[PDB]
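User: Modeling request: complex.
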Amino acid sequence: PAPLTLIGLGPMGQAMGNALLDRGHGLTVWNRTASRADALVARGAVRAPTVAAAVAANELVVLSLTDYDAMYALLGPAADALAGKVVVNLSSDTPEKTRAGARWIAEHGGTLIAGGVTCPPSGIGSPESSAFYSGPSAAFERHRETLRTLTRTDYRGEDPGLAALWYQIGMVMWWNAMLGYLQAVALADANGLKAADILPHASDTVAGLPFFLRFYADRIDTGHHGGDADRLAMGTASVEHILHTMADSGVDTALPEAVVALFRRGEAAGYAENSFSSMVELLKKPS
Amino acid sequence: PAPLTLIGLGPMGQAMGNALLDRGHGLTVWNRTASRADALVARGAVRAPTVAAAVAANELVVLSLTDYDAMYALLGPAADALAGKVVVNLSSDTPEKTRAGARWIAEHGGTLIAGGVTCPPSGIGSPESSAFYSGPSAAFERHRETLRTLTRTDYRGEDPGLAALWYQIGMVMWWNAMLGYLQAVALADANGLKAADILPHASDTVAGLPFFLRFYADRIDTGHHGGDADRLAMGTASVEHILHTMADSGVDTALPEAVVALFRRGEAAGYAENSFSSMVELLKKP
Ligand SMILES: NC(=O)c1ccc[n+]([C@@H]2O[C@H](COP(=O)([O-])OP(=O)(O)OC[C@H]3O[C@@H](n4cnc5c(N)ncnc54)[C@H](OP(=O)(O)O)[C@@H]3O)[C@@H](O)[C@H]2O)c1
Ligand SMILES: NC(=O)c1ccc[n+]([C@@H]2O[C@H](COP(=O)([O-])OP(=O)(O)OC[C@H]3O[C@@H](n4cnc5c(N)ncnc54)[C@H](OP(=O)(O)O)[C@@H]3O)[C@@H](O)[C@H]2O)c1
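Assistant: Request completed. Predicted assembly structure:
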């Protein structure tokens, strides 16, 4: 196993450091809050005295930070010593800001590989986990085996904005679903029900969603949103029932209102008799 | 196989009527659009000439209409014939509209059992189909074996609105995830990808949700909102990245702004260093 540097020891960074040590990689770590490296150092990791020494310790530098602005904040002061470094940035950001980070790293002599890890910390090191990757192909294949200690690698191409784009595409569905979980848990609590009580029904509901994703993927791609499978106006009545159920129980309604608002736009565009998938045409319009 | 009356012959009522005839139930049907009963009547179902005759023909009356206002419009003129009837209303609506409907059926001598079917029409009669049920237990227990012809019966309690409540609880996440799929498709199309291209990743995303449902289940229930797996402030940046990715790609941001606004309410309430699950404290009833 190759040696490498890991900067950023939040929930994800902690998990990566433990999985890299599990594999036997000579690991050099650094974190702004130094205390978060203690457990990894006790397991055999080398604590870098500074972030510059961390970068200098290896060719491969992995970052697990909140966003790309934290990269400039951490790597900025000693950016002159980034020449010849391979910076694998596993932080979420937009495709535009991801490209900007790649441009900034190249201008200082390094090369940036963009990554988007699609698993929680407990998923690091497991082969069922995956992560999108885009950036320079040669530098990626040169460090793919080390990156495969963390997750499976899904290389998307040369443009660094690709991995960030793919990460956002899945996360917009994920946050929508999990905020609906909190919304469902809040409704259950107002009626004397726990998250553990609604867990089986909530899990069965989301587990059947792939069948509908497949059924509507083919239909959306033909560009025709016929109301033969479902009628948007019936979806409006359904989400309105959710909203009023929430309000009747005294539960916050901010997100149910936003859902109803989009259906009302679908009806305002004349899509009442078409499938609810027709709203993908409103969603493609700017603003 | 007890006889019963079925009113409401849309796609759901059609499947129930066929499933009942399959098992051998004596079926009286009526629909506002009378031609909808043609296939069921050719199969042996008795067509009632009026809604009054339909209600008077049996003790068990099953409704499969749009909402509970449709029950008032339909049964209102025949409200006298409701005395002694057991109305099993399988239409989806809010718990409160269900409770008002139960009081209305009680005011006219009957008793209402509410049902929340969690399967499409093609699931009716299938063994793995299920429906929530609420209302007076004795009236439900006397007709449970007939209702079990349609789906499995999941009795949830005496409160008539309980069946609708459980239906709504599952539907919050279903619509949130499905609408998010449309958002992902639109973002994908603005960047040269089709729904077929992001379908495998979208399927992985939703199929991995039950792990996160279990992970945050007992944490939310015990009030443990620690930031060992996630900090809310990190999620704020993440949903801000989605929002500006939508904006940069020139697609709609209405729901991404609504998601960002909720996260910022979490920070505003002092939860920035807690897990994102702590936002349930903001969504809860006083
Ligand atoms: N959490 C997840 O489950 C998960 C999974 C996949 C993707 N991601 C992405 O992975 C990244 C890491 O998230 P996370 O949850 O592991 O942790 P996080 O809470 O976002 O923090 C990660 C690290 O960023 C550092 N950091 C943030 N802002 C900084 C700044 N201005 N200057 C210096 N250091 C800064 C923190 O340093 P300190 O230790 O000093 O605070 C911390 O070590 C994010 O981009 C996230 O979207 C999250
Ligand atoms: N279909 C599903 O995927 C599904 C799954 C779960 C449960 N459900 C719930 O099951 C119920 C029925 O589903 P569906 O697809 O059959 O709905 P639908 O197609 O809208 O059927 C509505 C039925 O109610 C009748 N109706 C509506 N308004 C009326 C009024 N004012 N007076 C008299 N009759 C009236 C209609 O009669 P006409 O024929 O004369 O128009 C029709 O028979 C809904 O509440 C739905 O949410 C549906």
